[PDB]
Amino acid sequence: SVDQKAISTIRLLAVDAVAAANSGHPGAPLGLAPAAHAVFKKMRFNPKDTKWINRDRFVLSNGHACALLYSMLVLYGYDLTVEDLKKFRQLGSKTPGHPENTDVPGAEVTTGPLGQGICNGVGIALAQAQFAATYNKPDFPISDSYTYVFLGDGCLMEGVSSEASSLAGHLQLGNLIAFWDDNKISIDGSTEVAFTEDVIARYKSYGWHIVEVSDADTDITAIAAAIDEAKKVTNKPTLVRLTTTIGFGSLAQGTHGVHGAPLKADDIKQLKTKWGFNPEESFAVPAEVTASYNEHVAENQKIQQQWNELFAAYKQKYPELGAELQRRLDGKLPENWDKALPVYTPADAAVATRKLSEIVLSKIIPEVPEIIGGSADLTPSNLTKAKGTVDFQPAATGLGDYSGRYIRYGVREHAMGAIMNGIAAFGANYKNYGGTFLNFVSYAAGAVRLSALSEFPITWVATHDSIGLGEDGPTHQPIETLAHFRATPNISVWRPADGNETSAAYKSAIESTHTPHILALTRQNLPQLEGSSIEKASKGGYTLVQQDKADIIIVATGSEVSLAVDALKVLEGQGIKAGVVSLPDQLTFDKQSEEYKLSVLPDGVPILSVEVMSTFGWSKYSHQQFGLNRFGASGKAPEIFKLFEFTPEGVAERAAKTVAFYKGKDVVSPLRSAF
Amino acid sequence: SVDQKAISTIRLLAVDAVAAANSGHPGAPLGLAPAAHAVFKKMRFNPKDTKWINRDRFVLSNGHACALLYSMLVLYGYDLTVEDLKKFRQLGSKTPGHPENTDVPGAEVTTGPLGQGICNGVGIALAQAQFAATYNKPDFPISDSYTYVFLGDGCLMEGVSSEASSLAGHLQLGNLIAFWDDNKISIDGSTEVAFTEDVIARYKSYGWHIVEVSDADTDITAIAAAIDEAKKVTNKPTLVRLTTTIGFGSLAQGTHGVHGAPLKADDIKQLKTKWGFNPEESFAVPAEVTASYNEHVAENQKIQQQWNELFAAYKQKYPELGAELQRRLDGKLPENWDKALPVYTPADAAVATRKLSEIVLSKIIPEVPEIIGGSADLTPSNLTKAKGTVDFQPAATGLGDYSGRYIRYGVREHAMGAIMNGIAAFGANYKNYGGTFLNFVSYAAGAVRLSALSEFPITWVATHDSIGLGEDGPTHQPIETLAHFRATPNISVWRPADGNETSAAYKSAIESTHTPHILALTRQNLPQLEGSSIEKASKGGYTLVQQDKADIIIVATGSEVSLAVDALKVLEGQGIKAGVVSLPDQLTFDKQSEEYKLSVLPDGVPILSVEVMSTFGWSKYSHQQFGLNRFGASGKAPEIFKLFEFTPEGVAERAAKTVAFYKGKDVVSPLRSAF
Ligand SMILES: C=C1[C@H](CCOP(=O)(O)OP(=O)(O)O)SCN1Cc1cnc(C)nc1N
Ligand SMILES: C=C1[C@H](CCOP(=O)(O)OP(=O)(O)O)SCN1Cc1cnc(C)nc1N
Ligand SMILES: O=C(CO)[C@@H](O)[C@H](O)[C@H](O)COP(=O)(O)O
Ligand SMILES: O=C(CO)[C@@H](O)[C@H](O)[C@H](O)COP(=O)(O)O
């Protein structure tokens, strides 16, 4: 049949791509081609409009199998060709060794790090449910799309997928349909050596529906029926067990050797001949297959055409909601939304930046409907919920509704991070956030790094940023954490010092379209600073206290800016004149003009950094660095600061030593470099 | 009864400790005091010998409940007193806000970061099984101890515990007995808002045995019976469901408010009066309770006394094994074990450091029985198994035996990290390791940081360290990873350049007693260097190529040392004389004398660093830094190096620019500082 020919075409494109590269993973593509064929036939998508908001989404969580995904996208006429497949895994190609949403048309997310994709799918489905609950009306199914995920044994072993699957079951996400490639093979061999759990029983314990397909090597009728069955179960996510043979058809099928290395040339020849292809030909695309696939594309395009008319009719009947939806699909925030940001003066009371964050969220959530977010079981400590909002829950629970805006993630930081990526990936201008303690953002590093690589505007509300948290002690107090994330490309790491800086941090986080944000916020109260503003803090770094005859400039962040200002007063008594720079985001600062940056960190004056955590990175901005490069302590926070000499007198002492160290030396800005 | 009085004493000590600090967590201690009393009565331990190798181990995975643990340790006469309890959460005390093994006598591991402790318990149990299989003989039960773990809903939500529980079930670890505090309350309120899974059904799916105690607020008889039942099930770990009331007895019992803040003074008064205590008294210790507990200590000490005689008799009957066991319990490696380390010359072939690592392990595993380790489903890529060894598996599977030395962790990096901490915590000189790709060590950051804080000599075999891995691309290629771990206190991060350096890295990792190691290893082949040796590389940094008239020194690590040597030749043609420093471990280097370090990084010469990842940290050792501060690419590795100008000519160009930048400037060593 043409279906059989399509499946063979997919299999052989994937194997030929791997062969051309002499690198990559043929096994799972061979095993999953029947399922991929069946799922893509059920999916609604437009290869010529990858951003249609009511498309079904597909996620390849087992991202190493990407030769499969690329083959589907090529066959369906996405902006990806056979010539791109011939450049699989080659420098600069549109067919990288794992899929990247920034590079591959039709890749919704970036996968390859196991476990992430299924969690991203949970997020896409969460967003779809929230979006549909917000906009759909009688006779106006604006959003009714599904989220299809392929995953393997590796994803099922990674703890992040357990977190997300538990939560997805709790959230009754009926439009999520995941497919487990049950092939009993991972890199170390049989799953019998390390993975003997009853996966199906575990998924039932989370509240998922199960469908089993015992011969997924051939039975596309049963795979299609499993999708139909899943669609009838509207209050549970579904796991479809696909029992497959890894490398199906290969001489080496059912072995770990077929997982991750090119097939032998003679193996590829026998594959081709057994399936009716020419063993002398590579990258064959039978025109029957193209035609069949084009039929499905044409049908899908007519569905999108009708959706566009539905949307026009919706704007007529529901003018307010229609305009809001249009704005969001155009990628634009509400006009002058930022007028809602709180502004402070130096006469206002001291406030912890976690509390300032709560206040910002309380003002901006009502103004910007595309903001949703949650906390990983730290809502009353992170202060991440705006009073009066309702939680995102299935209405059946009585605990919230899908139109809700606040997500109870539970103690699941890693899944929260990957779910945030999925919510961003959904689109419709979602600006989504997740709260935990800064030290436990580290639990989610796998996902955070992908936020940066994927260019997703997600936001971590990362409270309890330092030894300032006090008694919980060194297991809770960040040391390395800011250095880690600042060293990752494309992460804005805001550490606001006061009310105005906190508003600037949120302005940046919400306006972001391509850069994830981490907001490092305090437990302890900080004063409102003389000289701060949203405008100045929006530059990432700025001169807080200008001293035209400075003997030294002190550059600081967050809680240490007030400390630097107090140190300036101590220094004045010692006959030393200091300026103060506040550097609430190093990335934003780095992006300013060379002239702007030199106005903040000039030549001809020693510069001392002060921040109560690692000194790594700080030499970009300073000549000497006062930081904390050891673990913290359990005690009252002011006593910990005193112990480590983060006091006005301790900073002044180090400032004075810095001035003395550079006496009779020529000093140039830390911004200067040889190349 | 005296049991009832003991339980009340425990509860009130915990509440009084929290009250004195005006900080901490009274709820879980109140709820778990009956279970703690029952478990400690079943446990064998010596408060006067915390290192007795056949003790039962206890782990508080819900570490915030540590006022409970501290109360038990005080009551049993560990080196922790009521005066220490009065200093709960105070700077410098032996009663920190979360338990720390370095500070608290009787704390086996450091908990507080949720999910870790249960995984550490899996590791303690894994080690006990391996140890018993290695040493026990007929009539000589050298090791027969149990591992008892308390955990709460938070630990059960964290994905790391799912990973470890799946693996523990697979491994049939019958001496692991975990207790779930089923109190239906977390920080965000009822578990109904985020955690509605059937926990018991999930644990059955992993192959655990279950015992349910429906009234764990009072029924210590049933808790004791549950332990007895668990001990009869020798081929499954057991989860005991303890249905408790959080804050049992408090006016605020069964609420989230009792989780994490001090009780009201009037609440504490009514607690005391309802249980027969004086509401005017704090830190009461009824002498009946002390006496009862001392009886159990005396019995346990007699058990240890008999164990010591068993051990003496074992040494008589099994002289070889007895001497080996004695050596290990004394914390000493085999005499001259390091003579097994491979040594190379510059005439030897180029080899990838992953392969050099395999060769080291192949030579040292037969020489050092206390080495065990594994990989997170990357055995044939990390090259972490010595040929001829058998896997750690229950013999019932036919796949290995408990005497085995190689662990199939599956795709479970985070649990692998926390399990490694447990294996180290067991003691008996275990030197244990875990393989994955360097980029995915980041999945385990929660555990890695605890290795450092806990001072455990664990080792990550972290291959595929850079863009040198090639085609798998940017989702697999580290950028930030070394900076992250180098910025964490107390992590040795070795990045060996060649055969001799790889042997030095292992010498350090195996000899370690207080410092975790990460070995960053290559996929790609590297040449044997002229000038390398185990002796020189053991200093962490050393002069590879000495140039007495150097215009510049190039400091590099790993794969970039050979690059620097090739750049030196290019520079010679441009009339520039370079020296080369190899810096295989920055921590080890930092610990050398000031004079040694200055001999490597002298005054009066510009120093350029070269390493194909983040430049963070490098200003400690260099004036200018050539690194990679953007994500990588999918392509053939040499082409990626060329793209980013990590070539002999690209390094030479930057070296020449560095020399020019410092012309007519006075240059001092980067080792100098103002304070
Ligand atoms: C261990 C592996 C994988 C084997 C996974 O096996 P399945 O997932 O069972 O694949 P199949 O054999 O059916 O093709 S592929 C690469 N990976 C290394 C790796 C490790 N850790 C993380 C987080 N991300 C990774 N990609
Ligand atoms: C969210 C919480 C915990 C609530 C946990 O609830 P159970 O664990 O149910 O406690 P119980 O209410 O029964 O006393 S305590 C602190 N913690 C923050 C926290 C977050 N992430 C990580 C990794 N480590 C942490 N400690
Ligand atoms: O992490 C934990 C304990 O392991 C939480 O229980 C925190 O102790 C608490 O959330 C801090 O509370 P505040 O800092 O908001 O007072
Ligand atoms: O991480 C993955 C894919 O997501 C593995 O399949 C690696 O691709 C493989 O282990 C690398 O193999 P070698 O680098 O040892 O050739």
Ligand SMILES: [Ca+2]
């Ligand atoms: Ca598999």
Ligand SMILES: [Ca+2]
């Ligand atoms: Ca609980």
